[PDB]
Amino acid sequence: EMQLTPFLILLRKTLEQLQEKDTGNIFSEPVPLSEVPDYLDHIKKPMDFFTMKQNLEAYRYLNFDDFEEDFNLIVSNCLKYNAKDTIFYRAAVRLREQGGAVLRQARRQAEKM
Ligand SMILES: CN1C(=O)CNc2ccccc21
């Protein structure tokens, strides 16, 4: 029960804050299927920040949970695909930690709307 425009502004700002935590930009764009040809074997829904931005502007995120769900997918896909001893796996762990703090603060702002 709130106005749509300020909520989308908040999601845009939050998405920028999450991208800032992915310093290697490893989650900025879809995992390249031509470079990882087996990626889709067990990853049923790829996700990345560029796709999240598209979904946001298409009015596909109308509550915080739907936004946070796709962020969690970025993290979970990376934990699932990559072995524990890789930079990619540890990057997803760090993103989960740093991104969760960004998300808690952003949701507190949404609840004030
Ligand atoms: C597996 N993977 C990822 O999980 C994240 N991004 C990426 C870029 C290039 C090759 C592989 C990946």
Side-chain angles (χ1 to χ4, degrees), residues 2-43 45-79 81-111 113:
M2 61 184 60
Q3 190 187 340
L4 173 60
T5 297
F7 178 72
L8 297 181
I9 290 171
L10 172 64
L11 293 190
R12 295 184 183 102
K13 179 190 180 175
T14 304
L15 185 58
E16 288 182 323
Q17 290 171 332
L18 297 171
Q19 296 223 51
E20 286 170 16
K21 303 301 184 176
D22 169 27
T23 63
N25 289 348
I26 91 142
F27 306 114
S28 297
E29 299 184 346
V31 178
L33 293 190
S34 306
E35 175 180 342
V36 192
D38 74 332
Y39 186 75
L40 284 193
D41 286 13
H42 305 93
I43 301 303
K45 187 176 169 171
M47 191 49 59
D48 65 275
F49 287 132
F50 182 83
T51 299
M52 285 190 68
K53 178 63 173 188
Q54 289 182 316
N55 292 341
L56 192 168
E57 302 300 340
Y59 301 102
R60 292 202 177 95
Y61 299 140
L62 301 180
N63 51 68
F64 207 80
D65 283 318
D66 286 343
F67 177 84
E68 180 172 284
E69 182 180 280
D70 274 348
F71 169 77
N72 289 339
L73 191 52
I74 294 177
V75 172
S76 63
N77 285 345
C78 188
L79 300 173
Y81 182 79
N82 298 281
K84 289 184 83 188
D85 63 6
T86 62
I87 295 286
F88 287 160
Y89 187 98
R90 187 72 213 200
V93 174
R94 187 184 63 173
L95 183 64
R96 180 180 70 209
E97 299 173 347
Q98 296 182 336
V102 167
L103 287 162
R104 180 174 182 168
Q105 175 61 27
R107 188 193 288 271
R108 280 186 298 251
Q109 293 293 144
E111 296 169 351
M113 294 170 176

PDB file of all heavy atoms in Angstrom, residues 30-48, unseen atoms left out:
ATOM      1  N   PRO A  30      24.643 -12.028 -17.872  1.00  0.00           N
ATOM      2  CA  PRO A  30      24.441 -13.481 -17.807  1.00  0.00           C
ATOM      3  C   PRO A  30      25.744 -14.257 -17.937  1.00  0.00           C
ATOM      4  O   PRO A  30      26.675 -13.844 -18.636  1.00  0.00           O
ATOM      5  CB  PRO A  30      23.519 -13.757 -19.003  1.00  0.00           C
ATOM      6  CG  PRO A  30      22.724 -12.489 -19.145  1.00  0.00           C
ATOM      7  CD  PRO A  30      23.689 -11.381 -18.800  1.00  0.00           C
ATOM      8  N   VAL A  31      25.803 -15.390 -17.242  1.00  0.00           N
ATOM      9  CA  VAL A  31      26.949 -16.285 -17.438  1.00  0.00           C
ATOM     10  C   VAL A  31      26.995 -16.704 -18.906  1.00  0.00           C
ATOM     11  O   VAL A  31      25.981 -17.197 -19.442  1.00  0.00           O
ATOM     12  CB  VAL A  31      26.829 -17.516 -16.517  1.00  0.00           C
ATOM     13  CG1 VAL A  31      27.979 -18.479 -16.755  1.00  0.00           C
ATOM     14  CG2 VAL A  31      26.790 -17.079 -15.056  1.00  0.00           C
ATOM     15  N   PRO A  32      28.122 -16.532 -19.598  1.00  0.00           N
ATOM     16  CA  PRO A  32      28.155 -16.790 -21.047  1.00  0.00           C
ATOM     17  C   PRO A  32      28.047 -18.268 -21.395  1.00  0.00           C
ATOM     18  O   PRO A  32      28.979 -19.041 -21.146  1.00  0.00           O
ATOM     19  CB  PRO A  32      29.507 -16.205 -21.472  1.00  0.00           C
ATOM     20  CG  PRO A  32      30.347 -16.257 -20.234  1.00  0.00           C
ATOM     21  CD  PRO A  32      29.402 -16.015 -19.088  1.00  0.00           C
ATOM     22  N   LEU A  33      26.908 -18.668 -21.972  1.00  0.00           N
ATOM     23  CA  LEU A  33      26.674 -20.082 -22.252  1.00  0.00           C
ATOM     24  C   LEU A  33      27.655 -20.632 -23.278  1.00  0.00           C
ATOM     25  O   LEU A  33      27.934 -21.836 -23.286  1.00  0.00           O
ATOM     26  CB  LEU A  33      25.233 -20.308 -22.715  1.00  0.00           C
ATOM     27  CG  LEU A  33      24.118 -20.069 -21.692  1.00  0.00           C
ATOM     28  CD1 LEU A  33      22.787 -20.567 -22.233  1.00  0.00           C
ATOM     29  CD2 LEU A  33      24.444 -20.741 -20.369  1.00  0.00           C
ATOM     30  N   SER A  34      28.185 -19.778 -24.154  1.00  0.00           N
ATOM     31  CA  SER A  34      29.175 -20.252 -25.117  1.00  0.00           C
ATOM     32  C   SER A  34      30.497 -20.576 -24.436  1.00  0.00           C
ATOM     33  O   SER A  34      31.244 -21.441 -24.909  1.00  0.00           O
ATOM     34  CB  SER A  34      29.373 -19.211 -26.218  1.00  0.00           C
ATOM     35  OG  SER A  34      28.134 -18.870 -26.816  1.00  0.00           O
ATOM     36  N   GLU A  35      30.794 -19.904 -23.326  1.00  0.00           N
ATOM     37  CA  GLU A  35      32.004 -20.143 -22.553  1.00  0.00           C
ATOM     38  C   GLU A  35      31.804 -21.183 -21.456  1.00  0.00           C
ATOM     39  O   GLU A  35      32.777 -21.816 -21.025  1.00  0.00           O
ATOM     40  CB  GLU A  35      32.475 -18.812 -21.954  1.00  0.00           C
ATOM     41  CG  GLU A  35      33.658 -18.882 -21.012  1.00  0.00           C
ATOM     42  CD  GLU A  35      34.041 -17.513 -20.486  1.00  0.00           C
ATOM     43  OE1 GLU A  35      33.625 -16.508 -21.100  1.00  0.00           O
ATOM     44  OE2 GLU A  35      34.752 -17.441 -19.462  1.00  0.00           O
ATOM     45  N   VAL A  36      30.570 -21.379 -21.005  1.00  0.00           N
ATOM     46  CA  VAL A  36      30.238 -22.384 -19.998  1.00  0.00           C
ATOM     47  C   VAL A  36      29.137 -23.262 -20.580  1.00  0.00           C
ATOM     48  O   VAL A  36      27.976 -23.157 -20.159  1.00  0.00           O
ATOM     49  CB  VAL A  36      29.783 -21.718 -18.690  1.00  0.00           C
ATOM     50  CG1 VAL A  36      29.732 -22.731 -17.573  1.00  0.00           C
ATOM     51  CG2 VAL A  36      30.707 -20.575 -18.326  1.00  0.00           C
ATOM     52  N   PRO A  37      29.447 -24.134 -21.542  1.00  0.00           N
ATOM     53  CA  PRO A  37      28.374 -24.806 -22.298  1.00  0.00           C
ATOM     54  C   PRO A  37      27.489 -25.722 -21.473  1.00  0.00           C
ATOM     55  O   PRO A  37      26.358 -26.001 -21.892  1.00  0.00           O
ATOM     56  CB  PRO A  37      29.136 -25.584 -23.381  1.00  0.00           C
ATOM     57  CG  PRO A  37      30.470 -24.913 -23.470  1.00  0.00           C
ATOM     58  CD  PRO A  37      30.779 -24.453 -22.082  1.00  0.00           C
ATOM     59  N   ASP A  38      27.960 -26.213 -20.331  1.00  0.00           N
ATOM     60  CA  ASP A  38      27.169 -27.098 -19.486  1.00  0.00           C
ATOM     61  C   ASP A  38      26.379 -26.350 -18.423  1.00  0.00           C
ATOM     62  O   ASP A  38      25.713 -26.988 -17.599  1.00  0.00           O
ATOM     63  CB  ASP A  38      28.080 -28.127 -18.811  1.00  0.00           C
ATOM     64  CG  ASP A  38      28.919 -27.527 -17.694  1.00  0.00           C
ATOM     65  OD1 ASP A  38      29.233 -26.314 -17.743  1.00  0.00           O
ATOM     66  OD2 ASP A  38      29.264 -28.280 -16.760  1.00  0.00           O
ATOM     67  N   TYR A  39      26.434 -25.019 -18.429  1.00  0.00           N
ATOM     68  CA  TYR A  39      25.891 -24.249 -17.315  1.00  0.00           C
ATOM     69  C   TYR A  39      24.412 -24.542 -17.085  1.00  0.00           C
ATOM     70  O   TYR A  39      23.958 -24.591 -15.937  1.00  0.00           O
ATOM     71  CB  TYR A  39      26.119 -22.760 -17.552  1.00  0.00           C
ATOM     72  CG  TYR A  39      25.724 -21.896 -16.376  1.00  0.00           C
ATOM     73  CD1 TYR A  39      26.516 -21.833 -15.237  1.00  0.00           C
ATOM     74  CD2 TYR A  39      24.559 -21.142 -16.407  1.00  0.00           C
ATOM     75  CE1 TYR A  39      26.158 -21.034 -14.155  1.00  0.00           C
ATOM     76  CE2 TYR A  39      24.192 -20.341 -15.335  1.00  0.00           C
ATOM     77  CZ  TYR A  39      24.992 -20.294 -14.211  1.00  0.00           C
ATOM     78  OH  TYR A  39      24.629 -19.492 -13.141  1.00  0.00           O
ATOM     79  N   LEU A  40      23.651 -24.766 -18.156  1.00  0.00           N
ATOM     80  CA  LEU A  40      22.209 -24.950 -18.028  1.00  0.00           C
ATOM     81  C   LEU A  40      21.801 -26.364 -17.627  1.00  0.00           C
ATOM     82  O   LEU A  40      20.607 -26.603 -17.428  1.00  0.00           O
ATOM     83  CB  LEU A  40      21.494 -24.548 -19.322  1.00  0.00           C
ATOM     84  CG  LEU A  40      21.355 -23.044 -19.558  1.00  0.00           C
ATOM     85  CD1 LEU A  40      20.368 -22.769 -20.674  1.00  0.00           C
ATOM     86  CD2 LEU A  40      20.913 -22.354 -18.288  1.00  0.00           C
ATOM     87  N   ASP A  41      22.749 -27.295 -17.500  1.00  0.00           N
ATOM     88  CA  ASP A  41      22.410 -28.667 -17.126  1.00  0.00           C
ATOM     89  C   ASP A  41      21.612 -28.715 -15.826  1.00  0.00           C
ATOM     90  O   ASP A  41      20.596 -29.413 -15.735  1.00  0.00           O
ATOM     91  CB  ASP A  41      23.683 -29.505 -17.005  1.00  0.00           C
ATOM     92  CG  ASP A  41      24.288 -29.839 -18.349  1.00  0.00           C
ATOM     93  OD1 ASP A  41      23.871 -29.228 -19.356  1.00  0.00           O
ATOM     94  OD2 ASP A  41      25.185 -30.712 -18.393  1.00  0.00           O
ATOM     95  N   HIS A  42      22.051 -27.966 -14.812  1.00  0.00           N
ATOM     96  CA  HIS A  42      21.396 -27.981 -13.509  1.00  0.00           C
ATOM     97  C   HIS A  42      21.058 -26.586 -12.998  1.00  0.00           C
ATOM     98  O   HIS A  42      20.596 -26.455 -11.857  1.00  0.00           O
ATOM     99  CB  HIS A  42      22.236 -28.729 -12.467  1.00  0.00           C
ATOM    100  CG  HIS A  42      22.591 -30.128 -12.866  1.00  0.00           C
ATOM    101  ND1 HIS A  42      23.763 -30.440 -13.520  1.00  0.00           N
ATOM    102  CD2 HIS A  42      21.923 -31.297 -12.710  1.00  0.00           C
ATOM    103  CE1 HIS A  42      23.805 -31.741 -13.748  1.00  0.00           C
ATOM    104  NE2 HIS A  42      22.701 -32.284 -13.267  1.00  0.00           N
ATOM    105  N   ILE A  43      21.293 -25.546 -13.792  1.00  0.00           N
ATOM    106  CA  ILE A  43      20.887 -24.186 -13.448  1.00  0.00           C
ATOM    107  C   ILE A  43      19.613 -23.919 -14.236  1.00  0.00           C
ATOM    108  O   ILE A  43      19.661 -23.614 -15.431  1.00  0.00           O
ATOM    109  CB  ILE A  43      21.972 -23.158 -13.769  1.00  0.00           C
ATOM    110  CG1 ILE A  43      23.262 -23.473 -13.006  1.00  0.00           C
ATOM    111  CG2 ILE A  43      21.480 -21.753 -13.414  1.00  0.00           C
ATOM    112  CD1 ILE A  43      23.079 -23.537 -11.513  1.00  0.00           C
ATOM    113  N   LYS A  44      18.469 -24.021 -13.565  1.00  0.00           N
ATOM    114  CA  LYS A  44      17.196 -23.930 -14.272  1.00  0.00           C
ATOM    115  C   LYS A  44      16.757 -22.495 -14.542  1.00  0.00           C
ATOM    116  O   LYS A  44      15.945 -22.277 -15.450  1.00  0.00           O
ATOM    117  CB  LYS A  44      16.100 -24.706 -13.534  1.00  0.00           C
ATOM    118  CG  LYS A  44      15.768 -24.180 -12.143  1.00  0.00           C
ATOM    119  CD  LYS A  44      14.505 -24.844 -11.597  1.00  0.00           C
ATOM    120  CE  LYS A  44      14.175 -24.373 -10.188  1.00  0.00           C
ATOM    121  N   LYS A  45      17.256 -21.517 -13.787  1.00  0.00           N
ATOM    122  CA  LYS A  45      16.904 -20.116 -14.007  1.00  0.00           C
ATOM    123  C   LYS A  45      18.127 -19.247 -13.765  1.00  0.00           C
ATOM    124  O   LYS A  45      18.364 -18.778 -12.647  1.00  0.00           O
ATOM    125  CB  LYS A  45      15.739 -19.670 -13.124  1.00  0.00           C
ATOM    126  CG  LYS A  45      15.251 -18.257 -13.452  1.00  0.00           C
ATOM    127  CD  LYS A  45      14.032 -17.853 -12.630  1.00  0.00           C
ATOM    128  CE  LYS A  45      13.749 -16.359 -12.775  1.00  0.00           C
ATOM    129  NZ  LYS A  45      12.443 -15.961 -12.170  1.00  0.00           N
ATOM    130  N   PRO A  46      18.913 -18.988 -14.808  1.00  0.00           N
ATOM    131  CA  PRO A  46      20.033 -18.051 -14.675  1.00  0.00           C
ATOM    132  C   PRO A  46      19.537 -16.675 -14.264  1.00  0.00           C
ATOM    133  O   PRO A  46      18.412 -16.278 -14.563  1.00  0.00           O
ATOM    134  CB  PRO A  46      20.641 -18.020 -16.082  1.00  0.00           C
ATOM    135  CG  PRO A  46      20.096 -19.239 -16.781  1.00  0.00           C
ATOM    136  CD  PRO A  46      18.753 -19.486 -16.186  1.00  0.00           C
ATOM    137  N   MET A  47      20.389 -15.942 -13.557  1.00  0.00           N
ATOM    138  CA  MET A  47      20.046 -14.589 -13.148  1.00  0.00           C
ATOM    139  C   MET A  47      21.316 -13.760 -13.048  1.00  0.00           C
ATOM    140  O   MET A  47      22.411 -14.291 -12.821  1.00  0.00           O
ATOM    141  CB  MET A  47      19.267 -14.566 -11.825  1.00  0.00           C
ATOM    142  CG  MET A  47      18.646 -13.213 -11.453  1.00  0.00           C
ATOM    143  SD  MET A  47      17.695 -12.400 -12.755  1.00  0.00           S
ATOM    144  CE  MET A  47      16.449 -13.639 -13.085  1.00  0.00           C
ATOM    145  N   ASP A  48      21.157 -12.456 -13.239  1.00  0.00           N
ATOM    146  CA  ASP A  48      22.272 -11.515 -13.238  1.00  0.00           C
ATOM    147  C   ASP A  48      21.700 -10.114 -13.063  1.00  0.00           C
ATOM    148  O   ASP A  48      20.493  -9.898 -13.204  1.00  0.00           O
ATOM    149  CB  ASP A  48      23.053 -11.606 -14.546  1.00  0.00           C
ATOM    150  CG  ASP A  48      22.226 -11.182 -15.717  1.00  0.00           C
ATOM    151  OD1 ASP A  48      21.479 -12.029 -16.256  1.00  0.00           O
ATOM    152  OD2 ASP A  48      22.277  -9.990 -16.064  1.00  0.00           O
TER     153      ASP A  48
END
